[PDB]
Design a protein around this ligand. Structure first.
Ligand SMILES: NC(=O)c1ccc[n+]([C@@H]2O[C@H](COP(=O)([O-])OP(=O)(O)OC[C@H]3O[C@@H](n4cnc5c(N)ncnc54)[C@H](O)[C@@H]3O)[C@@H](O)[C@H]2O)c1
Ligand SMILES: NC(=O)c1ccc[n+]([C@@H]2O[C@H](COP(=O)([O-])OP(=O)(O)OC[C@H]3O[C@@H](n4cnc5c(N)ncnc54)[C@H](O)[C@@H]3O)[C@@H](O)[C@H]2O)c1
Ligand SMILES: O=C(O)[C@]1(O)C[C@H](CP(=O)(O)O)[C@@H](O)[C@H](O)C1
Ligand SMILES: O=C(O)[C@]1(O)C[C@H](CP(=O)(O)O)[C@@H](O)[C@H](O)C1
Ligand SMILES: [Cl-]
Ligand SMILES: [Zn+2]
Ligand SMILES: [Zn+2]
Lengths: 390, 390
């Protein structure tokens, strides 16, 4: 029943329904033995999911002597917490405990990419490094952010500029968390799923095109007492998620510290992050990546690398899931009331892209749905980039 | 003429006289090819040594097209800079350049352990990691801090609580920097040399006992125009330094992330760091380690592990170099005018020691000069520690 996926030579990804309720606590106490467990989550999630876990935990810790402690930290939800200040706050709190959290500490990231990125980075530098596990609660985290070990905080200048590669000891993907995920967040996560399919398999991309309606309806439907939101589409949903997770695992395993191949997971992100730096926190990450994918596909077509028919196909697939495909989208306009991305500000933000080689900007170019132009991001001239943003 | 030492499977340590003047710039441009070099140093050192390097640099960069840039950052000297604030300042400055410093950036740490620790930590998390090289300018850095890859900042609660293991690409040990080192700093560095000898070789320790007078006199002597401070003792000095560097390299190579053997380099540091947290910045690191070594040797004798004659021998060797051997030392008293280390405050600081296993404090115990009790720090009861501090 539990699907296991290996990454970087270790079988650390465990995926199934109900792992949180009756699996994680027990597995932690045995595979990640420690005297101190630190749970980091945000206030939205904390109130919904920590209770049953404290219980399951005490039940399993009782067996052990001396019994391990569980310390909980609740942070403000949203991109605002991915900051230097929040990192320092969690550190100081951990160092303040009695006794202080030491190097045997096991940190638990219970949440989406904001909590995962922040918690992973704290873990990576706490007394120079402690173990942590990821428990993704959003669709975006399950399929992308919780896997791979990249952690980071933002700064006023831009996205993920300070961080570290620090692999989690375990990654628990419990599909049950999606039951309570808001519709906008769920759609936001599909952008990474679509991105992953587009750089790896025409087939998977086709599958996403064919299940759009079915998925979107289950997500927007009103659930009656007793039934589950994804009642008749669990198999479909699980397949789409594991397909994304597996491909990411293969890529991370082949180029952990991004010397080449890993650049591909950044498709749509060169333009997407430049946009996010300006529109956050009103506009989400997946929504910015969606616009970035269309713009980067256009750039590839502009360079004679990608077919125009391919671009239209990417746009319609994104539109089919409710994701924005341009800065002129209606929502973007109202949600970012009083915010505009000028071509120059965007070009400025792109000079901060971590894939850039010195002053040369690098972008992932698709030659076809499921086929990258190269197994790395390519050098593109500023002039060419400007024409696509105009 | 250039002595090379391997560490962690790489020949990265280069030691000789004059490397800074006519070796580093050229070696950087060829072995650490990049468009951006960032030099971090403090104000004391900057004014003395950066000038000739800018020159040597431009001379070697000229050959290259496009020519690489050299950006210089000058920080306030002292333990005060090893802070979160200074780390954020350097990061923001680097991200503010035009164009921004990217992932090809090569950071140069020109200074002692304060600059090395801070710069190494910045490098470790900048865009998730960039290359850096160490150019130790103090005796303590040459023989200890610049080697091994441990980086960190302090917090009000204590020493090196946040940091990372990040190995430098090169380590350049230019003995010429010692010409301008203040006497107190030089003596401060001997504490790490003595510590290294005591955990590895009775012979080396003996050598240190026999050259004390000769070394101390050269260090305190008034140098005439034209002559060098270490005129007739270069061979002696070089041997003592390389002996320390080599042993550290062996240990780091055997246990990089401190799972066991590396604990040994922390001899005198369990009590030494607890003292430093209180007496810094008035009292230096080596001075605190000196007191910590005597206290930890006493603890080992208390546990029936070390001979009393061995303790006296450690005390006399430290005294012979001018290092303090107790909190009652005259200097400590006047320099820390209005500061006292109570047994409880010290015990509190020791609960934050990174070697501790959960609530169990771990200390390195010597069974004899040159012979550790175990190849790791040992668990010691609080009661036993208290009797030695009383
Ligand atoms: N490290 C990586 O590899 C990586 C990969 C992609 C994206 N990211 C980062 O991920 C971040 C975005 O993450 P995200 O979209 O998961 O956002 P998030 O963590 O802020 O979670 C989205 C929202 O949903 C709430 N929520 C979470 N799970 C819920 C659940 N099951 N039920 C109800 N409410 C729930 C949260 O409180 C929050 O408000 C960005 O900062 C982005 O840069 C990082
Ligand atoms: N990372 C490690 O493995 C490690 C190992 C041991 C000690 N340390 C850390 O090292 C730090 C202490 O380092 P330090 O004693 O080198 O101090 P430091 O870097 O502050 O330098 C000491 C002083 O000498 C000046 N100076 C440096 N080189 C000079 C030179 N050649 N000529 C003239 N003036 C010079 C500096 O400006 C400063 O004022 C502590 O913070 C300690 O925790 C870290
Ligand atoms: O390598 C990865 O895992 C990513 O490219 C990492 C990026 C963030 P980065 O560009 O800051 O590395 C993320 O947004 C993307 O979805 C997946
Ligand atoms: O492992 C090391 O290199 C050290 O033990 C590292 C410590 C600092 P740490 O106890 O913070 O690791 C240092 O002071 C000591 O001289 C050498
Ligand atoms: Cl940090
Ligand atoms: Zn992303
Ligand atoms: Zn030390």
């Amino acid at each position: 029943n539990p699907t296991k996926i290996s990454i970087l030579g270790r079988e650390s990804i465990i995926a199934d329904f109900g792992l949180w309720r009756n699996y994680v606590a027990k597995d932690l106490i045995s595979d990640c033995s420690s005297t101190t467990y630190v749970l980091v989550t945000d206030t939205n999630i904390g109130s919904i999911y920590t209770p049953s876990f404290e219980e399951a935990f005490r039940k399993r810790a009782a067996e052990i002597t001396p019994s391990p402690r569980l310390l909980i930290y609740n942070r403000p939800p949203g991109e605002v917490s991915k900051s230097r200040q929040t990192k320092a706050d969690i550190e100081d709190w951990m160092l303040s405990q009695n006794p202080p959290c030491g190097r045997d500490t096991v940190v638990i990231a219970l949440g989406g990419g904001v909590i995962g990125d922040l918690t992973g980075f704290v873990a990576s530098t706490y007394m120079r490094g402690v173990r942590y596990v990821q428990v993704p609660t959003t669709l975006l985290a399950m399929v992308d952010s919780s896997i791979g070990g990249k952690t980071a905080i933002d700064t006023p200048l831009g996205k993920n500029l300070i961080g570290a590669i620090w692999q989690p000891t375990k990654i628990y993907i419990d599909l049950e968390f999606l039951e309570t995920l808001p519709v906008r967040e769920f759609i936001n996560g599909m952008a990474e799923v679509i991105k992953t399919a587009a750089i790896s398999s025409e087939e998977e991309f086709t599958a996403l095109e064919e299940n759009a309606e079915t998925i979107l309806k289950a997500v927007r439907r009103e659930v009656t007492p007793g039934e589950h939101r994804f009642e008749g589409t669990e198999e479909i949903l699980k397949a789409r998620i594991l397909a994304s997770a597996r491909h990411k695992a293969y890529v991370v395993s082949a180029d952990e510290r991004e010397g080449g191949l890993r650049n591909l997971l950044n498709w749509g992100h060169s333009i997407g992050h430049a946009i996010e730096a300006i529109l956050t926190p009103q506009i989400l990450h997946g929504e910015c990546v969606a616009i970035g994918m269309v713009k980067e596909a256009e750039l590839a077509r502009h360079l004679g690398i990608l077919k125009g028919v391919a671009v239209s196909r990417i746009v319609k697939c994104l539109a089919a899931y409710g994701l924005p495909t341009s800065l002129k989208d209606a929502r973007i306009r109202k949600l970012t009331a009083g915010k505009h991305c000028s071509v120059d500000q965007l070009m400025f933000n792109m000079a901060l892209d971590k894939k850039n080689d010195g002053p040369k900007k690098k972008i992932v170019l698709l030659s076809a749905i499921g086929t990258p132009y190269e197994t790395r991001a390519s050098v593109v001239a500023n002039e060419d980039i400007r024409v696509v943003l105009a």
